[PDB]
């Protein structure tokens, strides 16, 4: 596959096969580069390329591992902003990546587990690097990620309404409420727990929500 | 010729990211003010662009 | 069939099958099937030209040791336990003295059959199977059992004089330790890698000498039943730890006279100072007592399953659990005779007693050899 | 409508008759929380009210409910044990 | 000396300053020959310097180094038996791996541990030789020879201290066994030192049940027989004479459920003690308090053993949790499935107390799902108030999709094909997409079947069926029985109970037949249709728009919807016609699916695959002959051929098939076979009675990462199909089939390999008792 060549002969073969995208071959170059020379001057950049190319060859855990390798190699680095984005950007793509999106199905009613991991690392990017090549856009990811969390948590908040668990209507919506007031998924959920209060005959407590409904009428 | 199944660069399939959450936060009246965002839901809101959205590659 | 019946093996048998002298048998009697493939420290007695032997299915017969024809016969068909008429299942060797056939059973129950008829003149259940042949000695039935115990039973009735745990292995690490009586000391090894003298009067540890390795955190011999029986010349205990690693050591104190604490010794006899042994590649080697000075070894037996080195009819006789018998010369000389009186294989040692060479194989049982 | 079969869905978080006797007007939250633990609904922005509302649907008509809200003061010292049945 | 400079010669992995800190000849430090030799050993104490050659040009120092790093590979040789990552688990635990720094002292040390691995495997005649193969720039390959002669095997158990219960009889209860009697075989057997431990607890249970409660196994002595295999065991026990469970004095925090507790402490005082029964009875309380909300039912039993009357006296000390532990529940592994579909499959409600088994019934609902690979969770107490145990239902979903094949060969025929692919649970939405169909020269057949299972949340299972069978059997024309048939049925699922569900739907069945076959019962249907169709030719056509109403019903308490082992599922399947139909009839049928586990591990389960049906007319009219029951082949009875089991049709004396290939496709036609004969395929009965009994069997020669998706199931098959309309009047000089004893029979085993598109089930089965018209294909290869 990739034998003991000159390291840049190992590298520039991959550097073309990055652009060629032959990551069946390029990654095996960048591996056998850093298998032999993880002490290469661009072996950090190989690790940057591996965080790149694993996320280009669907090795998103290995991307995370190469992130963790780059965490293990240099957890401070001027491309940790590239990394902590890519830590979220893997976890963004780790969150929801089915072909049902290509077949046109919602995945925000699906598990936002790595959304919250991307909600960490994108926010860890903008906390670690509030200035980066990725700080601005990943912030919109985050606000969208909690909206994805809103459309997720609403998806069961109506379920308790058809379950009829008006206790579990409220606390799920209240779970949305302690997490995001801004999302309309919370704000469409706003009269529902109030209605569920009226199912629990907490009309008066629902009036307190109707007070919100009065003052958040738009 | 040969088999065709591959994967390459892209960073944001949509800009639903950039089409982030609506802002219908508490304009609720007095006394009706419950807790609103918990943890990093209080998002560290800061900006550094580079290229944003779908525009910037990773290296 | 056997183009495909291949499996994983590793062995290489004896070379050098010779007969400078002629080997033969004294008789055959084939006393049942004794030990068998299921191992046991049942070892016969050839006392008074009476074959005091049995098979472990029960039938204990004294034999007229010329043709092995039955002097008496009894049966250890055990009528009880969870079963009536059980096999004898004997752990200890056939110790015979007086009106008593002392045999340790794997029922942990030792007998004394009256050697005029085989009637059990006493029987006593002991602590675990007799992992040694019963060293019935000085009023005491001294047995190293499975639980490392120093049994002493009043051999006239089996009244237990004491039973105390001793140098004791981690598991049933197979090997006897056969507590010998030497100068007021109950002298034993123990299948744990130490060697001792205990008080022969009461079972009070005179000394225990830790020597060298045993299994358990040290992978050593499980093809060498390492003799933890001390063969004590009057002041010097000669014994192996649990790995054949030989040491010579004082009797009253354990003080190391010398050691060949590197050995692979399966069986050993301190034949004066021609200490005949079995190597792990089954070389018979002659050491001395002033230091285990190799007088000779010889490689004429390789990867065998030998019996003990014995001298009978003037030659260093060795048999095996391949049923081969070999007459090494005593000193540095080779096969003087090779006998194939068996191939079922002798797990009993050559009994050079009453002028014969009594050997009970596993199932091709008791053979008596002359030359 | 005229549908008949019910799996008879339940919703707990109530207080037994033992439980409502465990507390009194004047008890802190904690005093209730030692006696009753927490409710599975408390007051989000108002004063401390500890809502133990039961819910259950038996059959076609009629709904079982046992609403037990424990309105404390702001100090948690209990001010109102609201005992309330179905409907 | 005080150094000018050290030349750091030989570096590859370790840095210069990383060397230099371990150099006590460093810049500023004085240089001594001891400090040089300390620079030898401390850089040996870096662990990555195979050599350290510290020297000097006065004080111009220079340190030459070879390196133990990168082990480029570890080569394993002779380990066909043992997987080498476990051998690497000996190696990778030992501070070395591919890329690492091999001290050549650790060659035998890992080899000892690798033999200690064998020693802890159960091998002892198994040695290992590690060969260092040094490679470029520092590197080494670790070739490992493996000298595996033999392992160990059990042979014997001596139980001393036992006098009552028989050892080999107990070995017939124990795990470590060895037997092939002349009326008994359980295969071949071996040793494990933890099968030791269960045999202790087999025995520990074996005395505890009887009352032996001062029973205690004293010690155990496994023979280290010097033969590298010989394992004999000396088991010191105290049998420990029996005790009566002579009274419960249950106490502690009984949580007010004491009368409920006393039922779970209902014993016979003076019955011989069984602590396992007590061990059962504690959990009953723990499920009692578990269903009483208390997820933490601390129960301590104390059987106060009274030897004076040979009894025990049962103290039980109870401590409940708290009731209202179910604050909420979480769900995980819903990353492709719709979440609330999984949330609706639970019965323990958030904001309640704990019904412990509603979770499990809720898990049973998910167990009854079948689009899972795991039904599990995280039962987590959320810390703080005694009202938050929040259950995080982590589950693994299953793959979907299924292909079925019916085409034989291409590239020598025209545009002719078979289709059919399933997308049941379409993309986590539940949408049961299963669609088939085919365009050939003999037919142009189509079929649709998709269910929205929860178009409304009641299990409102929007199962719309459609089909379009433009069936021709085109030989050169429409001659031999062409029917263009078309129609639909949308059927729906109804909540009857929590394991019961009904089905109903209206079936549109429009058929436009032509050139019908000259056999008797086909016309005898049409003669009882009121048609008077000519029998000596195929000169009749038939439009029929059957307006039918179909129905059904489900029982479901059986283990899994993809891989069940226990329970039963009963599935009603019926239909009826309405006024307005072109034929007033019905056809109702039913299938049975029960699972009887022989094994308590349920590795052997009797499967009852038996199916019934009957269909007839609704007055003045008849169930159509294409609705007759067939079998053979892909039925219960396999090794047969499909639709070869049942009644068989008599022809008429026949001339024109409406096209007669010359002694081909004979319909008793003018081309041969004149003067009515009788056909051999199953024209089928108006009754069905088929049966098969399948027996689950494990698969040993497969790496079981995918053998868990495999069920081998032996069976013996038997069935009968007959027509109560088959009247011995023209079927009098021919076989008459109004008799329920058409008892055709086979046996065999199935081949269930779950692919990524599911199981494709084959069978080499063989008929043994056959009746009229049974054709046999012993090699049945299906989905």
Q: Which two tokens stand for residue E277?
A: 């029964």
CA angle centred on E185, ends E184 and E188, rounded to 5°: 150
Residue of A20, A77, A182 to mutate, interface with B, max B Cβ within 10 Å:
A182
Q: Which residues of chain D neighbour E385 with C-beta distances below 8 Å?
A: 33, 37-38
Instruction: Determine the distance in angstroms separating the CA of D19 from the nearest CA of chain A, rounded to an integer.
Output: 19
Element (DSSP H or E) covering residue E217: strand E216-222
Instruction: Determine the length of chain C.
Output: 371
E312's CB contacts (< 8 A; 6+ apart) are E211, E213, E243, E244, E245, E246, E273, E303, E304, E305, E306
Q: Does E388 lie at the interface with A, CB-CB under 8 angstroms?
A: no
Radius of gyration of chain E (CA): 38
Do A101 and A141 belong together in one domain?
A: yes
CA distances from E27 to C270, E16, E17, E513 (A): 66, 12, 11, 103
Instruction: Determine the distance in angstroms separating the CA of B1 from the nearest CA of chain A, rounded to an integer.
Output: 16
Task: Supply the CATH number for residue D19's domain.
Answer: 3.30.1450
Selecting from A82, A120, A130 the residue whose C-beta is nearest the C-beta of B46 gives A130
Count CB neighbours of C161 within 10 A.
18
Radius of gyration of chain D (CA): 15
Torsion of CA B45, B49, B54, B56, to 10 degrees: -140
Q: Answer whether C326's CB lies under 8 Å from C334's CB.
A: no
Distance CA E100, CA E73 (A): 10
Q: Answer whether C72's CB lies under 8 Å from C21's CB.
A: no
Q: Which residues of chain E neighbour A98 with C-beta distances below 8 Å?
A: 336, 427-428
The CATH H-level superfamily of E5-64 is: membrane protein fhac (3.10.20.310)
Q: Does E344 lie at the interface with A, CB-CB under 8 angstroms?
A: yes
Residue of A17, A101, A133 to mutate, interface with B, max B Cβ within 10 Å:
A133
Q: Answer whether C94's CB lies under 8 Å from C44's CB.
A: yes
Q: Which residue of chain B comes nearest to A137, CA vs CA? A: B52
Query: Using the beta-carbon criterion (under 8 Å), do E427 and A100 form an inter-chain contact?
Result: yes
At E695 the three-state DSSP class reads strand
Q: Rounded to a whole number, what is the distance in angstroms from the first to the last CA of chain E?
A: 84
Beta bridge partners of C70: C63
Distance CA C279, CA C306 (A): 10
Q: Answer whether D44's CB lies under 8 Å from D26's CB.
A: no
Domain ranges of chain E: 5-64, 71-151, 153-238, 244-319, 329-397, 402-408+415-781
Instruction: Determine the distance in angstroms separating the CA of D41 from the nearest CA of chain A, rounded to an integer.
Output: 7
Angle at which helices A43-54 and A80-95 pack, to 10 degrees? 20
Pairing of strands C296-298, C135-137: unpaired
Q: Does B34 lie at the interface with A, CB-CB under 8 angstroms?
A: yes
Closest CA to C228 of C237, C217, C219, C218: C237
Query: Using the beta-carbon criterion (under 8 Å), do A163 and E428 form an inter-chain contact?
Result: no
Closest CA to B14 of A118, A83, A183, A102: A102
Same fold? E329-397, E402-408+415-781: no
Q: Which domain holds residue D73?
A: 10-84
Beta bridge partners of C275: C270, C287
Q: Does E741 lie at the interface with D, CB-CB under 8 angstroms?
A: no
Q: Which two tokens stand for residue E754?
A: 């779950």
* Residue matched to tokens 């009256």: C114
Distance CA C288, CA E487 (A): 105
The CATH H-level superfamily of E153-238 is: membrane protein fhac (3.10.20.310)
E152's CB contacts (< 8 A; 6+ apart) are E122, E123, E124, E191, E228, E229, E230, E231
Q: Is D50 inside any structural domain?
A: yes
Q: Does E457 lie at the interface with D, CB-CB under 8 angstroms?
A: no
Selecting from D5, D13, D33 the residue whose C-beta is nearest the C-beta of E351 gives D13
Buried-state track C254-270, b at ≥16 Cβ within 10 A, e below 16 = beebbbbbebbbbbbbb
Residue of A104, A180, A204, A206 to mutate, interface with B, max B Cβ within 10 Å:
A180
Do A142 and A168 belong together in one domain?
A: no
Q: Which two tokens stand for residue E264?
A: 């779970």
A91's CB contacts (< 8 A; 6+ apart) are A64, A114, A115, A117, A118, A120, A121
Distance CA A40, CA E742 (A): 81
Count CB neighbours of E545 within 10 A.
15
Instruction: Give the CA count within 13 Å in the CB-facing half-sphere of C258.
Output: 9
Q: What does residue D64 show for φ and ψ, rounded to 5 degrees?
A: -80, 135
Query: Using the beta-carbon criterion (under 8 Å), do A35 and E12 form an inter-chain contact?
Result: no
At E206 the three-state DSSP class reads helix
C273's CB contacts (< 8 A; 6+ apart) are C287, C288, C289, C290
Angle at which helices E106-121 and E84-91 pack, to 10 degrees? 130
Selecting from E331, E338, E350 the residue whose C-beta is nearest the C-beta of A168 gives E350
Q: Which residue of chain E comes nearest to C173, CA vs CA? A: E224
Q: Give long-range contacts, CB 8 A cutoff, 24+ apart: E212-219.
A: E212/E239, E212/E240, E212/E241, E212/E242, E212/E243, E213/E240, E213/E242, E213/E243, E213/E273, E213/E275, E213/E303, E213/E305, E213/E312, E214/E238, E214/E240, E214/E241, E214/E243, E214/E305, E214/E307, E215/E239, E215/E240, E216/E240, E218/E161, E219/C147
Q: Which residue of chain D comes nearest to A167, CA vs CA? A: D41
Selecting from E256, E349, E386 the residue whose C-beta is nearest the C-beta of D37 gives E386
Q: Which two tokens stand for residue E436?
A: 């088939």
Query: Which CATH code is given to the segment(s) E71-151?
Result: 3.10.20.310
Q: Which residues of chain E neighbour C10 with C-beta distances below 8 Å?
A: 125, 147, 149
Domain E402-408+415-781 fold: Porin (2.40.160)
Q: E 346-365 residues with CB below 8 A of A?
A: 349-352
Instruction: Determine the distance in angstroms separating the CA of A207 from the nearest CA of chain D, rounded to an integer.
Output: 12
DSSP E645: B
Domain count for chain D: 1
Query: Using the beta-carbon criterion (under 8 Å), do A165 and D11 form an inter-chain contact?
Result: yes
Q: Does E149 lie at the interface with A, CB-CB under 8 angstroms?
A: no
At E125 the three-state DSSP class reads strand
Instruction: Determine the distance in angstroms separating the CA of E232 from the nearest CA of chain C, rounded to an integer.
Output: 8
Do A7 and A44 belong together in one domain?
A: yes
Beta bridge partners of E143: E75, E131
The data reach a resolution, in angstroms, of 9.5
Q: How big is the A-E interface in CB pairs under 8 Å? A: 71
Closest CA to E244 of E218, E214, E217: E214
Q: Give long-range contacts, CB 8 A cutoff, 24+ apart: E591-600.
A: E592/E568, E593/E558, E593/E568, E593/E569, E594/E558, E594/E567, E594/E568, E594/E569, E595/E558, E595/E559, E595/E564, E595/E565, E595/E566, E595/E567, E595/E568, E597/E565, E597/E566, E598/E695
Pick the last residue of a domain from A96, A119, A150: A150
Selecting from A109, A111, A165 the residue whose C-beta is nearest the C-beta of E332 gives A111
CA distances from C136 to C40, C111, C153, C181, E234 (A): 18, 12, 8, 10, 23
Domain count for chain A: 3
CA distances from C288 to A31, C260, C277 (A): 63, 10, 11
* Residue matched to tokens 């892909």: E634
Selecting from E112, E165, E234 the residue whose C-beta is nearest the C-beta of C82 gives E165
Do A47 and A16 belong together in one domain?
A: yes
Distance CA E117, CA C22 (A): 49
Q: What does residue E142 show for φ and ψ, rounded to 5 degrees?
A: -110, 85
Q: Is D39 inside any structural domain?
A: yes
Q: Is D3 inside any structural domain?
A: no
Q: Do chains A and C touch (3 or more CB pairs under 8 A)?
A: no
At E767 the three-state DSSP class reads strand
Instruction: Determine the distance in angstroms separating the CA of A42 from the nearest CA of chain B, rounded to an integer.
Output: 12
Distance CA A6, CA E456 (A): 65
Residue of A137, A170, A186, A215 to mutate, interface with B, max B Cβ within 10 Å:
A137
At E550 the three-state DSSP class reads strand
Instruction: Determine the distance in angstroms separating the CA of D38 from the nearest CA of chain E, rounded to an integer.
Output: 6
C110's CB contacts (< 8 A; 6+ apart) are C92, C102, C103, C104, C123, C124, C125, C126, C130, C134, C141, C143, C153, C158
Beta bridge partners of E272: E244
Pairing of strands E482-495, E605-614: unpaired
Contacts of B among chains (3+ CB pairs under 8 A): A, D
Query: Using the beta-carbon criterion (under 8 Å), do A168 and E427 form an inter-chain contact?
Result: no
Buried-state track C52-79, b at ≥16 Cβ within 10 A, e below 16 = bbbbbbbbbbbbebeebeebbebebebe
Q: Which residues of chain D neighbour A208 with C-beta distances below 8 Å?
A: 45-46
* Residue matched to tokens 């069961």: A156
Q: What does residue E382 show for φ and ψ, rounded to 5 degrees?
A: -80, 125
Distance CA E632, CA C25 (A): 74
DSSP D29: H
A40's CB contacts (< 8 A; 6+ apart) are A7, A11, A33, A34, A46
Distance CA E457, CA E460 (A): 6
Buried-state track E211-241, b at ≥16 Cβ within 10 A, e below 16 = bbbbbebeebbbbbbbbbbbbbbbbbbebbe
Q: Which residue of chain D comes nearest to E350, CA vs CA? A: D11
Q: Which two tokens stand for residue A92?
A: 């963004």
Selecting from E326, E349, E351 the residue whose C-beta is nearest the C-beta of D41 gives E351
Q: Which two tokens stand for residue E185?
A: 């075989």
Count CB neighbours of E663 within 10 A.
10
Closest CA to E549 of E504, E594, E495: E504
Q: Does D65 lie at the interface with A, CB-CB under 8 angstroms?
A: yes
- Helix H, strand E, coil C: the string for chain C is CCCCCCCCCCCCCCCCCCCCCCCCCCEECCCCCCCCCCCCCCCCEEECCEEEEECCCCEEEEEECCCCEECCCEECCECCCCCCCECCCECCCCEECCCCEECCECCCEEEEEECCCCEEEEEEECCCCCCCCCEEECCEEEEECCCCEEEEEECCCCEEEEEEECCCCCCECCCCCCCEEECCEEEECCCCCEEEEEECCCCCEEEEEECCCCCCCCCCCCCCCCCCCCCCECCEEEEECCCCCEEEEECCCCCEEEEECCCCCCCEEEECCEEEEECCCCCEEEECCCCCCCCEEECCCCCCCECCCEEECCEEEEEECCCEEEEEECCCEEEEEEEECCCCCCCCCCECCCCCCEECCCCCCCEECCC
Q: Which domain holds residue A53?
A: 1-74
Provide the CA A201 distance to its chain's centre, in angstroms: 40
Distance CA B56, CA B9 (A): 10
Q: Answer whether C152's CB lies under 8 Å from C161's CB.
A: yes
Name the region of A126 (left: φ>0; alpha: ψ -120 to 50; beta: rest).
Answer: alpha
Instruction: Determine the distance in angstroms separating the CA of D36 from the nearest CA of chain B, rounded to an integer.
Output: 24
CA distances from E347 to D64, E231, E462, E496 (A): 17, 53, 24, 16
Selecting from E352, E385, E498 the residue whose C-beta is nearest the C-beta of D13 gives E352
Domain E329-397 fold: Ubiquitin-like (UB roll) (3.10.20)
At E289 the three-state DSSP class reads helix
Q: Does D41 lie at the interface with A, CB-CB under 8 angstroms?
A: yes
Distance CA E491, CA E255 (A): 50
How many helical (H) and strand (E) elements, i.e. helices and strands, does chain B have? 0, 0
Would you say the C-alpha torsion C131, C133, C138, C139 has a positive or negative sign? positive
At E508 the three-state DSSP class reads strand
- Helix H, strand E, coil C: the string for chain A is CCCCCCHHHHHHHHHHHHHCCCCCCHHHHHHHHHHHCCCCCCHHHHHHHHHHHHCCCCCHHHHHHHHHHHHHHCCCCCCHHHHHHHHHHHHHHHHCCCCCCCCCCCCCCCCCHHHHHHHHHHHHHHHHCCCCCCHHHHHHHHHHHHHHHHHHHHHHHCHHHHHCCHHHHHHHHHHHHCCCCCCHHHHHHHHHHHHHHHHCCCHHHHHHHHHHHHHCCC
Residue of D40, D52, D70 to mutate, interface with E, max E Cβ within 10 Å:
D40
Element (DSSP H or E) covering residue E318: strand E311-319
CA distances from D75 to D47, D49, D72, D80 (A): 9, 11, 7, 13
Contacts of D among chains (3+ CB pairs under 8 A): A, B, E
Distance CA E90, CA E343 (A): 45
Distance CA E273, CA E264 (A): 16
Q: Does E7 lie at the interface with A, CB-CB under 8 angstroms?
A: no
Do A57 and A125 belong together in one domain?
A: no
Selecting from C81, C129, C223 the residue whose C-beta is nearest the C-beta of E234 gives C129
DSSP E30: B
Angle at which helices A60-73 and A43-54 pack, to 10 degrees? 160
Pairing of strands C59-64, E588-597: unpaired
Distance CA E404, CA E757 (A): 10
Count CB neighbours of A9 within 10 A.
12
Q: Does D7 lie at the interface with A, CB-CB under 8 angstroms?
A: no
Query: Which CATH code is given to the segment(s) E244-319?
Result: 3.10.20.310
Q: Does A5 lie at the interface with E, CB-CB under 8 angstroms?
A: no
Distance CA E182, CA E110 (A): 47
Selecting from E149, E164, E232 the residue whose C-beta is nearest the C-beta of C10 gives E149
Distance CA E768, CA C127 (A): 62
Beta bridge partners of E185: none
Would you say the C-alpha torsion A32, A37, A39, A43 has a positive or negative sign? negative
């Amino acid at each position: 596959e990739v034998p003991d060549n000159p390291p840049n002969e190992i590298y520039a073969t991959a550097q073309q096969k990055l652009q060629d995208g032959n990551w069946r071959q390029a990654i095996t170059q960048l591996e056998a580069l850093d298998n032999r020379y993880p002490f290469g001057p661009y072996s950090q950049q190989v690790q940057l390329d591996l965080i790149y190319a694993y996320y280009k060859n669907a090795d998103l855990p290995l991307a995370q591992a190469a992130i963790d390798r780059f965490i293990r190699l240099n957890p401070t680095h001027p491309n940790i902003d590239y990394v902590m984005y890519m830590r979220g950007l893997t976890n963004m793509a780790l969150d929801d990546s089915a072909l049902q999106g290509f077949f046109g199905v919602d995945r925000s009613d699906r598990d936002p587990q790595h959304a919250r991991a991307a909600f960490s690392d994108f926010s860890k990017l903008v906390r670690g690097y509030p200035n980066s090549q990725y700080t601005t856009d990943a912030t919109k990811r985050l606000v969208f990620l909690k909206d994805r969390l809103a459309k997720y948590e609403y998806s069961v908040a109506e379920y308790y309404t058809e379950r009829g668990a008006w206790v579990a209507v409220v606390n799920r919506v209240e779970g949305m409420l302690r997490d995001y007031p801004d999302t309309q998924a919370t704000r469409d959920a706003l009269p529902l727990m109030e209605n569920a209060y009226r199912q629990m005959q907490m009309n008066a407590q629902a009036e307190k929500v109707a007070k919100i409904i009065a003052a958040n009428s738009s | 010729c040969s088999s065709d199944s591959r994967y390459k660069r892209q960073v944001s399939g949509d800009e639903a990211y950039l089409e982030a959450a609506p802002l219908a936060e508490l304009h609720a009246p007095a006394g009706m003010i419950l807790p609103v965002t918990s943890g990093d839901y209080a998002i560290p809101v800061t900006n550094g662009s580079g290229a944003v959205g779908k525009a910037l590659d990773i290296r | 069939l056997f183009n495909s019946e291949e499996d994983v093996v590793k062995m290489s048998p004896l070379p050098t099958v010779e007969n400078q002298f002629t080997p033969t048998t004294a008789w055959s009697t084939s006393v049942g099937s004794g030990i068998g493939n299921f191992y046991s420290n049942l070892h016969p007695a050839l006392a008074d030209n009476v074959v005091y032997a049995a098979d472990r299915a029960g039938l204990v017969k004294a034999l007229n040791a010329d043709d092995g024809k039955e002097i008496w016969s009894v049966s250890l068909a055990e009528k009880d336990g969870w079963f009536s008429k059980e096999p004898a299942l004997l752990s200890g060797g056939v110790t015979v003295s007086g009106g008593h056939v002392y045999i340790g059973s794997e029922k942990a129950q030792v007998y004394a059959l009256n050697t005029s008829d085989g009637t059990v003149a006493w029987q006593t259940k002991v602590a675990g199977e007799a992992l040694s042949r019963p060293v019935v000695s000085d009023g005491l039935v001294l047995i190293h059992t499975s639980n490392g115990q120093l049994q002493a039973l009043n051999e006239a009735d089996g009244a237990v004089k004491w039973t105390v745990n001793l140098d004791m292995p981690s598991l049933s690490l197979r090997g006897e330790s056969a507590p010998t009586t030497a100068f007021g000391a109950a002298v034993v090894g123990g299948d744990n890698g130490r060697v001792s003298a205990v008080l022969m009067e009461q079972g009070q540890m005179i000394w225990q000498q830790r020597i060298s390795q045993a299994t358990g955190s040290t992978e050593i011999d499980r093809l060498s039943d390492v003799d933890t029986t001390p063969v004590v010349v009057n002041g010097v205990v000669f014994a192996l730890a649990y790995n054949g690693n030989l040491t010579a050591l004082d009797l009253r104190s354990g003080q190391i006279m010398w050691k060949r604490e590197l050995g692979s010794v399966n069986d050993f006899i301190v034949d004066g100072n021609r200490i005949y042994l079995v190597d792990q590649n089954d070389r018979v080697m002659a050491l001395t007592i002033d230091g285990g000075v190799t007088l000779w070894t010889q490689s004429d037996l390789l990867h065998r399953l030998l019996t003990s080195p014995v001298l009978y009819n003037g030659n260093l006789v060795v048999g095996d659990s391949e049923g081969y018998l070999h007459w090494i010369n005593v000193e540095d000389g080779r096969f003087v005779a090779q006998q194939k009186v068996d191939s079922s294989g002798f797990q009993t040692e050559p009994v050079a007693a009453d002028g014969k060479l009594l050997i009970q194989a596993k199932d091709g049982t008791v053979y008596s050899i002359t030359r | 409508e005229r549908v008949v079969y019910r799996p008879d869905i339940n919703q707990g978080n109530y207080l037994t008759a033992n439980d409502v006797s465990k507390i009194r007007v004047g008890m802190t939250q904690q005093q209730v929380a030692y006696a009753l633990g927490t409710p599975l609904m408390s007051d989000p922005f108002g004063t401390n009210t500890w809502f133990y509302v039961f819910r259950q649907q038996p059959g076609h008509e009629g709904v079982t409910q046992q609403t037990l809200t424990l309105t404390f003061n702001s100090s948690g010292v209990l001010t109102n044990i609201d005992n309330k049945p179905a409907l | 000396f005080v150094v000018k400079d050290i030349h750091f010669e030989g570096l590859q992995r370790v840095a210069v300053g990383a060397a230099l800190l371990s150099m006590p000849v460093r810049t500023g430090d004085t240089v001594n020959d001891e400090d040089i030799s300390n620079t030898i050993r401390a850089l040996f104490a870096t662990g990555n310097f195979e050599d350290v050659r510290v020297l000097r040009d006065g004080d111009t120092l220079l340190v030459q180094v070879k390196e133990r790093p990168t082990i480029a590979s570890i080569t394993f040789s002779g380990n066909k038996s043992v997987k080498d990552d476990m051998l690497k688990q000996n190696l990778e635990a030992s501070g070395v791996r591919v890329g690492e720094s091999l001290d050549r002292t650790t060659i035998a040390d890992i080899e000892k541990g690798l033999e200690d691995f064998y020693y802890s495997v159960g091998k002892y005649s198994a040695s290992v030789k590690a060969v260092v193969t040094p490679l470029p720039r520092n590197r080494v390959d670790l070739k490992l020879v493996f000298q595996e002669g033999v392992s160990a095997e059990i042979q014997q158990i001596n139980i001393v201290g036992n006098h009552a219960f028989t050892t080999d009889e107990l070995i017939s209860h124990f795990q470590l066994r060895d037997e092939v009697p002349w009326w008994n075989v359980v295969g071949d057997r071996k040793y494990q030192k933890q099968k030791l431990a269960g045999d202790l607890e087999t025995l520990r249970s074996y005395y505890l049940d009887r009352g032996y409660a001062r029973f205690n196994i004293d010690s155990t002595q496994v023979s280290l027989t010097p033969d590298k295999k010989g394992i004999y065991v000396t088991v010191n026990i105290t049998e420990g004479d029996q005790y009566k469970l002579s009274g419960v004095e249950v106490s502690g925090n009984l949580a007010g459920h004491s009368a409920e507790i006393e039922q779970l402490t209902k014993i016979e005082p003076g019955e011989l003690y069984n602590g396992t029964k007590v061990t059962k009875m504690e959990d009953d309380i723990k499920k009692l308090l578990g269903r009483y909300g208390y997820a933490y039912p601390r129960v301590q039993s104390m059987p106060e053993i009274n030897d004076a009357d040979k009894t025990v006296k049962l103290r039980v000390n109870v401590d409940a949790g708290n009731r209202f532990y179910v604050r909420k529940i979480r769900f995980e592994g819903n990353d492709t499935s719709k979440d609330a579909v999984l949330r609706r499959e639970m019965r323990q409600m958030e904001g309640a107390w704990l019904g412990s088994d509603l979770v499990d019934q809720g898990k049973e609902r998910l167990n009854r799902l079948g689009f899972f690979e795991t039904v599990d969770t995280d039962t987590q107490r959320v810390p703080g108030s005694p009202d938050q145990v929040d259950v995080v239902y982590k589950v693994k979903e299953r793959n979907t999709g299924s292909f079925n094949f019916g085409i034989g060969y291409g590239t020598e025929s025209g545009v002719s094909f078979q289709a059919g692919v399933q997308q049941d649970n379409w993309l986590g939405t539940g949408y049961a997409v299963g669609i088939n169909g085919t365009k050939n020269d003999y037919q142009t057949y189509a079929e649709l079947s998709v269910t929205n299972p929860y178009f409304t949340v009641d299990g409102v299972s929007l199962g719309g069926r459609l089909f379009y069978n433009d069936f021709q059997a085109d030989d050169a024309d429409l001659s031999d029985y062409t029917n263009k048939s078309y129609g639909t049925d949308v059927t729906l699922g109804f909540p009857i109970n929590e394991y019961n569900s009904l089905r109903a739907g209206l079936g549109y069945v429009h058929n436009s037949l032509s050139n019908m076959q000259p056999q008797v019962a086909m016309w005898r249907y049409l003669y009882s249709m009121g048609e008077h169709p000519s029998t000596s030719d195929q000169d009749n056509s038939f439009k029929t728009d059957d307006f039918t109403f179909n129905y059904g019903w489900t029982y479901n308490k059986l283990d899994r919807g993809y891989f069940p082992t226990d329970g039963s599922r009963v599935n009603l399947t019926g239909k009826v016609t309405i006024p307005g139909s072109d034929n007033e009839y019905y056809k109702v049928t039913l299938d049975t699916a029960t699972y009887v586990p022989i094994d308590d591990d349920h590795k052997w389960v009797v499967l009852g695959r038996t199916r019934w049906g009957y269909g007839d007319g609704l007055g003045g009219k008849e169930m159509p002959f294409y609705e007759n029951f067939y079998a053979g082949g892909s039925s219960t009875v396999r090794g047969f051929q499909s639709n070869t089991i049942g009644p068989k049709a008599v022809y008429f004396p026949h001339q024109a098939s409406n096209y007669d290939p010359d002694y081909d496709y004979e319909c008793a036609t003018q081309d041969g076979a004149k003067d009515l004969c009788k056909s051999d395929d199953a024209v089928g009965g108006n009754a069905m009675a088929v049966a098969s009994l399948e027996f689950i069997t494990p698969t040993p020669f497969i790496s079981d990462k995918y053998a868990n998706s495999v069920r081998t199931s032996f069976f013996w098959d038997m069935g009968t199909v007959w027509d109560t309309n088959w009247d011995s009047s023209q079927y009098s000089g021919y076989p008459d089939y109004s008799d329920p004893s058409n008892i055709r029979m086979s046996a065999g085993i199935a081949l269930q390999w779950m692919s990524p598109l599911g199981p494709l089930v084959f069978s080499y089965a063989q008929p043994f008792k056959k009746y009229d018209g049974d054709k046999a294909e012993q090699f049945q290869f299906n989905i």
